[PDB]
Protein backbone atom coordinates (compact mmCIF):
# COMPACT_ATOMS: atom_id res chain seq x y z
CA UNK A 1 0.00 0.00 0.00
CA UNK A 2 1.05 3.61 -0.58
CA UNK A 3 -0.28 7.07 0.25
CA UNK A 4 1.95 10.03 -0.61
CA UNK A 5 1.46 13.78 -0.28
CA UNK A 6 3.17 17.01 -1.05
CA UNK A 7 2.43 20.01 1.14
CA UNK A 8 3.37 23.38 -0.22
CA UNK A 9 2.83 27.03 0.68
CA UNK A 10 -0.12 27.31 -1.78
CA UNK A 11 -1.77 23.91 -1.43
CA UNK A 12 -1.39 20.19 -1.05
CA UNK A 13 -1.54 17.16 -3.32
CA UNK A 14 -2.22 13.59 -2.24
CA UNK A 15 -2.10 10.27 -4.14
CA UNK A 16 -3.09 6.77 -3.05
CA UNK A 17 -3.14 3.32 -4.66
CA UNK A 18 -6.37 1.25 -4.67
CA UNK A 19 -5.12 -2.26 -3.73
CA UNK A 20 -6.62 -4.19 -0.82
CA UNK A 21 -5.24 -7.68 -0.10
CA UNK A 22 -6.83 -10.30 2.08
CA UNK A 23 -4.99 -13.42 3.22
CA UNK A 24 -6.47 -16.69 4.46
CA UNK A 25 -4.53 -19.66 5.87
CA UNK A 26 -2.19 -20.70 8.68
CA UNK A 27 -0.39 -17.81 10.49
CA UNK A 28 3.28 -18.96 9.79
CA UNK A 29 2.36 -19.31 6.08
CA UNK A 30 0.62 -15.89 5.84
CA UNK A 31 3.61 -14.30 7.66
CA UNK A 32 6.06 -15.86 5.15
CA UNK A 33 4.07 -14.55 2.14
CA UNK A 34 3.67 -11.07 3.72
CA UNK A 35 7.44 -10.76 4.25
CA UNK A 36 8.09 -11.63 0.56
CA UNK A 37 5.37 -9.22 -0.66
CA UNK A 38 6.32 -6.20 1.49
CA UNK A 39 10.05 -6.59 0.63
CA UNK A 40 9.75 -5.87 -3.13
CA UNK A 41 10.43 -9.58 -3.93
CA UNK A 42 7.05 -10.09 -5.62
CA UNK A 43 6.87 -7.69 -8.60
CA UNK A 44 3.90 -8.96 -10.67
CA UNK A 45 0.35 -10.17 -9.86
CA UNK A 46 1.37 -13.42 -11.65
CA UNK A 47 4.32 -14.00 -9.22
CA UNK A 48 2.02 -13.19 -6.29
CA UNK A 49 -0.45 -15.97 -7.13
CA UNK A 50 2.40 -18.44 -7.76
CA UNK A 51 3.87 -17.57 -4.31
CA UNK A 52 0.47 -17.83 -2.52
CA UNK A 53 0.04 -21.33 -4.07
CA UNK A 54 3.59 -22.29 -2.96
CA UNK A 55 2.97 -21.22 0.65
CA UNK A 56 -0.62 -22.61 0.66
CA UNK A 57 -2.21 -19.17 1.23
CA UNK A 58 -5.45 -18.16 -0.52
CA UNK A 59 -5.22 -14.47 -1.57
CA UNK A 60 -7.96 -12.09 -2.80
CA UNK A 61 -6.88 -8.83 -4.42
CA UNK A 62 -9.32 -5.90 -4.81
CA UNK A 63 -8.19 -2.81 -6.80
CA UNK A 64 -10.99 -0.26 -6.21
CA UNK A 65 -10.26 1.08 -2.67
CA UNK A 66 -10.44 4.89 -2.45
CA UNK A 67 -7.65 5.73 0.03
CA UNK A 68 -7.77 9.52 -0.42
CA UNK A 69 -10.62 12.03 -0.26
CA UNK A 70 -11.23 15.75 0.27
CA UNK A 71 -13.42 17.02 3.13
CA UNK A 72 -13.82 20.83 3.66
CA UNK A 73 -10.64 21.80 1.80
CA UNK A 74 -8.64 19.22 3.79
CA UNK A 75 -7.19 16.14 2.02
CA UNK A 76 -7.43 12.88 3.98
CA UNK A 77 -5.33 9.79 3.15
CA UNK A 78 -5.53 6.45 4.93
CA UNK A 79 -3.75 3.12 5.13
CA UNK A 80 -5.22 0.28 7.28
CA UNK A 81 -4.59 -3.33 8.45
CA UNK A 82 -6.30 -6.32 10.16
CA UNK A 83 -4.06 -8.76 12.14
CA UNK A 84 -5.07 -11.08 14.99
CA UNK A 85 -8.25 -9.10 15.74
CA UNK A 86 -6.27 -5.83 15.87
CA UNK A 87 -7.49 -3.16 13.41
CA UNK A 88 -4.69 -0.69 12.68
CA UNK A 89 -5.17 2.63 10.77
CA UNK A 90 -3.09 5.69 9.99
CA UNK A 91 -4.49 8.94 8.53
CA UNK A 92 -2.78 11.94 6.89
CA UNK A 93 -4.54 15.30 6.81
CA UNK A 94 -3.18 18.00 4.50
CA UNK A 95 -3.95 21.49 3.31
CA UNK A 96 -1.87 24.56 2.25
CA UNK A 97 1.17 24.81 4.58
CA UNK A 98 -0.68 22.49 7.03
CA UNK A 99 -0.46 18.72 7.83
CA UNK A 100 -1.24 16.26 10.66
CA UNK A 101 -0.80 12.53 11.22
CA UNK A 102 -3.14 10.43 13.39
CA UNK A 103 -3.17 6.68 14.27
CA UNK A 104 -6.11 4.54 15.45
CA UNK A 105 -5.11 3.54 19.02
CA UNK A 106 -7.88 1.22 20.31
CA UNK A 107 -11.15 3.06 19.40
CA UNK A 108 -9.70 6.62 19.08
CA UNK A 109 -8.00 8.27 16.09
CA UNK A 110 -5.10 9.92 17.93
CA UNK A 111 -2.92 12.76 16.62
CA UNK A 112 0.76 11.71 16.60
CA UNK A 113 2.33 14.63 14.70
CA UNK A 114 1.80 17.76 12.61
CA UNK A 115 3.78 20.49 10.92
CA UNK A 116 3.73 23.72 9.00
CA UNK A 117 5.44 24.76 5.73
CA UNK A 118 6.63 22.52 2.92
CA UNK A 119 6.80 18.70 3.23
CA UNK A 120 6.69 15.36 1.38
CA UNK A 121 5.06 12.51 3.36
CA UNK A 122 5.12 8.84 2.24
CA UNK A 123 2.91 6.16 3.89
CA UNK A 124 3.78 2.54 3.01
CA UNK A 125 5.92 -0.53 3.77
CA UNK A 126 9.73 0.09 4.03
CA UNK A 127 10.16 -0.74 0.31
CA UNK A 128 7.36 1.47 -1.19
CA UNK A 129 8.45 4.35 1.10
CA UNK A 130 12.13 4.22 -0.01
CA UNK A 131 11.14 3.99 -3.70
CA UNK A 132 8.70 6.96 -3.51
CA UNK A 133 11.16 9.01 -1.43
CA UNK A 134 13.90 8.29 -4.02
CA UNK A 135 11.59 9.27 -6.93
CA UNK A 136 10.54 12.54 -5.13
CA UNK A 137 14.12 13.69 -4.22
CA UNK A 138 15.20 12.86 -7.79
CA UNK A 139 12.59 15.05 -9.56
CA UNK A 140 11.70 17.82 -7.08
CA UNK A 141 13.43 21.19 -7.47
CA UNK A 142 13.51 24.03 -4.87
CA UNK A 143 11.17 26.47 -6.72
CA UNK A 144 8.76 23.80 -8.05
CA UNK A 145 5.06 24.64 -7.74
CA UNK A 146 1.91 22.64 -6.89
CA UNK A 147 1.43 21.75 -10.60
CA UNK A 148 4.91 20.18 -10.81
CA UNK A 149 4.09 18.28 -7.57
CA UNK A 150 1.09 16.68 -9.39
CA UNK A 151 3.37 15.31 -12.20
CA UNK A 152 5.96 14.13 -9.60
CA UNK A 153 3.40 12.24 -7.46
CA UNK A 154 2.06 10.56 -10.64
CA UNK A 155 5.61 9.45 -11.48
CA UNK A 156 6.11 8.19 -7.82
CA UNK A 157 2.86 6.16 -7.98
CA UNK A 158 3.77 4.68 -11.40
CA UNK A 159 7.35 3.79 -10.40
CA UNK A 160 6.16 2.03 -7.21
CA UNK A 161 3.46 -0.05 -9.01
CA UNK A 162 6.11 -1.24 -11.51
CA UNK A 163 8.29 -2.57 -8.66
CA UNK A 164 5.82 -4.36 -6.36
CA UNK A 165 2.57 -6.32 -6.32
CA UNK A 166 1.70 -4.74 -2.88
CA UNK A 167 0.44 -1.64 -4.79
CA UNK A 168 -2.10 -1.50 -7.71
CA UNK A 169 -1.35 0.16 -11.08
CA UNK A 170 -4.52 2.25 -10.62
CA UNK A 171 -4.29 5.22 -8.24
CA UNK A 172 -6.14 8.37 -7.16
CA UNK A 173 -5.08 11.97 -6.81
CA UNK A 174 -6.81 14.73 -4.79
CA UNK A 175 -5.60 18.32 -4.52
CA UNK A 176 -6.47 21.52 -2.76
CA UNK A 177 -5.54 25.20 -2.69
CA UNK A 178 -7.37 25.76 0.67
CA UNK A 179 -5.48 26.59 3.86
CA UNK A 180 -8.17 25.12 6.17
CA UNK A 181 -6.77 24.01 9.54
CA UNK A 182 -6.27 20.22 9.44
CA UNK A 183 -6.29 20.01 13.30
CA UNK A 184 -10.06 20.84 13.13
CA UNK A 185 -10.66 17.67 11.01
CA UNK A 186 -8.47 15.48 13.30
CA UNK A 187 -10.65 16.67 16.27
CA UNK A 188 -13.89 15.76 14.40
CA UNK A 189 -12.44 12.24 13.82
CA UNK A 190 -11.10 11.89 17.45
CA UNK A 191 -14.44 10.41 18.61
CA UNK A 192 -15.68 7.35 16.57
Amino acid sequence: ALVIAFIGKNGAVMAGDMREITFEGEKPDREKLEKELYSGSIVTDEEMQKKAEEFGVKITVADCKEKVSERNGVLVGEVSSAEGGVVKKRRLYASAGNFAIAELINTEMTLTSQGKGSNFIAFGNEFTKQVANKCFKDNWTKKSNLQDAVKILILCMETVARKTASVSKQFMIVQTASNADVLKVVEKDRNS
Binding site: A1, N119, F120, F123, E126
Partner: peptide, 17 residues
Protein backbone atom coordinates in the same frame (compact mmCIF):
# COMPACT_ATOMS: atom_id res chain seq x y z
CA UNK B 1 -5.80 -10.35 7.33
CA UNK B 2 -7.34 -7.30 5.56
CA UNK B 3 -5.22 -4.96 3.36
CA UNK B 4 -1.65 -4.91 1.95
CA UNK B 5 -0.16 -1.92 3.96
CA UNK B 6 2.85 -2.17 6.22
CA UNK B 7 2.07 1.54 6.17
CA UNK B 8 0.03 1.00 9.40
CA UNK B 9 2.97 -0.89 11.08
CA UNK B 10 6.12 0.61 9.47
CA UNK B 11 6.39 4.31 10.48
CA UNK B 12 5.43 7.16 8.07
CA UNK B 13 8.19 8.87 6.15
CA UNK B 14 8.24 12.69 6.74
CA UNK B 15 10.63 14.76 4.60
CA UNK B 16 11.08 18.49 5.36
CA UNK B 17 11.24 20.79 2.33
Amino acid sequence: ASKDPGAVDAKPLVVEI
